[PDB]
């Protein structure tokens with residue numbers, strides 16, 4: 001559709017991601033939604049295929065080419081299964097990213113290759129029960145006691161919380177310094193004191209494990225400090241562009257899957273003597289869905305090209321995320337409507353798309369936060 | 379809020395419906411959604427309280443006062459549990475209605491009192507796998523053989539399909555007459571040949587049993603013809619005003635429940651140093667939710683007053699249904715957004731409201747059909 005605008009590598013990566021999604025994700029997404037569980041074997045396949053190392057340079061064991069290819073791979077994965085896309089976005093951007101940005105050679109050597117291959121899935125632990133959008137108002141603490149960082153507190157909504165091998169954890173080390181008193185820590189998820197609760201019950205992306213985690217004298221070595229002491233907030237904000245490009249692409253992929261079901265259904269479902277695709281009201285909906293999907297893709301790819309070249313792109317990534325997420329609810333709602341009563345049945349799957357899409361306006365910065373960011377830079 | 383505009387009876391009925399919903403529906407709605415099942419004991423309580431006879435005159439065993447009181451009772455029930463509201467709307471309008479409109483004295487004597495008290499729940503069987511919005515294109519047949527109407531065919535999406543004691547069933551009796559060749563039948567649901575399939579798996583109103591029903595030489599007495607032969611289509615269209623007023627009120631009630639959770643959450647959840655109700659963006663959302671809810675209520679009550687006086691009100695009821703259903707998705711989406719990440723969790727219940735609300739744009743005539751009807755009468 002847009003292909004002559006893509007390099008051969010980008011096309012190749014897009015094609016491999018789609019073949020994997022068509023074969024391994026789309027037929028099983030309904031089952032995983034019902035089970036609220038993603039098989040470990042599927043995660044391992046995303047790993048083997050290089051989809052969990054797309055932000056890490058090849059020389060360090062990853063599969064980075066450019067951010068356009070990542071955005072393309074993410075759209076295809078999301079179109080197959082939204083929960084896999086969540087897993088993938090978080091693991092790439094806020095699992096690998098911070099270690100790549102701020103890890104020492106020893107830390108990178110221990111972690112990057114394994115994470116990039118998906119042998120070790122990463123989690124990012126910043127949000128707390130009382131603190132989401134105001135991400136700097138933290139109450140989990142870390143104090144250096146007996147040559148160890150000892151963490152105490154509680155994190156909320158940890159994506160990959162059960163399956164993660166390592167957690168990037170943000171805790172207050174120097175209370176009197178406020179926003180400049182937070183630090184980042186690498187915490188093996190088998191460390192005594194690292195207590196993972198039951199996955200939350202959610203409306204959608206039900207197979208993406210999302211867990212509360214409690215830290216009860218969670219003791220790690222002194223060298224598991226990530227970055228400099230007090231640098232925690234910078235580090236927590238250092239991968240917003242990749243994070244938003246990824247979720248924007250996830251929104252795009254979910255919307256697209258629902259649109260593809262609706263176009264198909266419309267060309268086959270006859271009502272009042274014609275396929276319903278021929279009724280003006282359906283035509284109109286389909287046209288609007290295509291427009292919004294294409295506009296979202298272009299926004300995402302724009303932000304991705306900027307990021308590839310190391311250019312400023314926070315606003316552009318936040319626009320993509322905002323637009324893609326809000327349109328995906330609309331596209332998915334119309335997809336349901338085009339199916340009539342069948343749209344509301346679990347068997348027709350557009351209802352799952354609608355449920356999964358809705359989370360994209362909330363995480364990776366709420367729509368309200370995206371607006372603040374875009375406006376503040378005008 | 380609006381109370382001085384209501385009669386004392388209307389207020390009394392509203393108050394009793396709300397007390398019942400607060401006590402018996404709202405605490406259990408989450409459980410019934412999870413079980414995809416409405417207890418028989420709750421249905422029987424809706425019966426005892428008079429909520430299942432609100433369209434039938436008191437002298438015939440019902441509780442009819444006026445349609446405003448029905449609209450008020452429906453909003454309160456829906457605010458407690460959407461699945462109960464579906465059950466109630468369908469039972470009142472297209473269960474009792476057609477027997478009241480078109481039944482003989484013998485048929486009314488056998489059925490009305492029992493249905494009005496909820497001892498016998500009614501189902502309405504018109505839609506077929508190939509025929510929804512084009513409701514006159516029917517293929518289930520009924521042929522008078524050996525002093526019996528013998529029905530053969532298939533109906534789709536029968537609300538109350540498992541729990542119904544009697545079904546109003548629409549079948550082709552005289553093929554050569556087209557739209558004027560359809561007839562209506564009263565079919566005890568224990569009649570051999572009346573084969574109820576498993577409830578459908580749905581995104582929401584999961585506790586409202588919605589079943590495919592197959593008719594395999596389903597044989598009933600000749601006198602179970604409802605109305606005159608060929609009158610079936612008229613009868614199927616004879617309660618559209620009540621049906622739409624009811625679902626409009628259901629949409630209204632669901633939206634209102636979600637709005638009430640969001641206002642409450644907003645006054646208690648602090649973020650960036652203030653209750654979030656004080657942030658302009660939340661204020662704006664809350665204001666818009668109230669406006670849409672109030673406008674929907676006024677549309678519903680307008681249609682209800684007209685119907686009470688026996689005045690033409692198809693357009694007005696279809697406006698109410700269209701507006702209330704489309705706004706309810708928006709109000710429920712904002713309700714989720716106001717809760718942030720908690721909005722997506724099953725425990726906070728606004729996600730169930732959002733799932734339940736979505737069906738109101740589809741059944742009781744899709745939004746597209748509502749628009750046709752309103753436009754054709756300008």
Ligand SMILES: Cc1cc2c(cc1C)N(C[C@H](O)[C@H](O)[C@H](O)COP(=O)(O)OP(=O)(O)OC[C@H]1O[C@@H](n3cnc4c(N)ncnc43)[C@H](O)[C@@H]1O)c1[nH]c(=O)[nH]c(=O)c1N2
Nearest residue numbers: 126127132133157158159366368650657659715716718719
């Ligand atoms: C499934 C899932 C997965 C994840 C996460 C959530 C969920 C649901 N998140 C947490 C997520 O980032 C978080 O939910 C959002 O930041 C929103 O914060 P709260 O949930 O605290 O709502 P919060 O209380 O921040 O917001 C409530 C509402 O108020 C609004 N609001 C708040 N402040 C405002 C202001 N100043 N002006 C206007 N409006 C304002 C918001 O827009 C929102 O609509 C996370 N976190 C993490 O650390 N690691 C992870 O892996 C994940 N993953």
Ligand SMILES: Cc1cc2c(cc1C)N(C[C@H](O)[C@H](O)[C@H](O)COP(=O)(O)OP(=O)(O)OC[C@H]1O[C@@H](n3cnc4c(N)ncnc43)[C@H](O)[C@@H]1O)c1[nH]c(=O)[nH]c(=O)c1N2
Nearest residue numbers: 272279281337338340341504505510511535536537744746
């Ligand atoms: C939970 C539940 C419960 C019930 C029901 C459904 C569900 C999901 N209904 C069936 C319901 O009334 C039905 O789904 C709608 O009439 C829509 O019809 P279809 O599902 O066949 O879609 P249909 O094929 O009619 O429509 C598909 C889409 O095309 C659009 N469309 C169709 N014709 C068009 C035209 N000419 N111009 C523009 N757009 C057009 C529609 O707006 C819709 O968006 C029912 N029925 C019943 O008999 N008894 C019952 O108890 C219930 N209850």
